[PDB]
Amino acid sequence: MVLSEGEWQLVLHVWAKVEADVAGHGQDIYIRLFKSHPETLEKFDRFKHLKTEAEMKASEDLKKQGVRVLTALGAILKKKGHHEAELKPLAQSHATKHKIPIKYLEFISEAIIHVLHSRHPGNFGADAQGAMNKALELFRKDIAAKYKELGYQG
């Protein structure tokens, strides 16, 4: 699949707003992910002990992790589809070390869309959401392909 320049513009326009507060968006996304799909928390040995949203918001380590995640995703989105190099290390670690199924990548994609919709309604109308969904679907499609090459069914 391929996004048009117009669709990429919608994606990068709202992403520019996210970048005004990377740490805050990361926390919101994780909290949404862990509350909606608790099973995903079990994959994080360093955070699986967190019991409440309050503890999650107070975790300095979780905040730092969120920044790393959004920074990596932002770098990929900014490549506008030409992300082969960026995807390699990410696919290898998540398939071989962390063992993250594609289903969980779908769950975090849902959390990202939920948070953007909540925080940036003016820059996340129907067309913008459609573009972001398309960008995330492309990301998941390419990661899934790499997973297969690496020997992980995902």
Ligand code: HEM
């Ligand atoms: C938006 C998609 C995602 C991106 C861009 C992303 C990115 C990253 C990055 C950059 C790291 C640090 C370096 C590395 O180990 O590769 C990382 C670590 C990790 N990721 Fe992800 N990730 C994503 C989704 C997920 C999901 C959905 C899960 C599981 C529910 C997950 C589980 C982990 C774990 C367990 C670690 C290691 C954390 C630690 O060091 O304690 N990731 N991720």
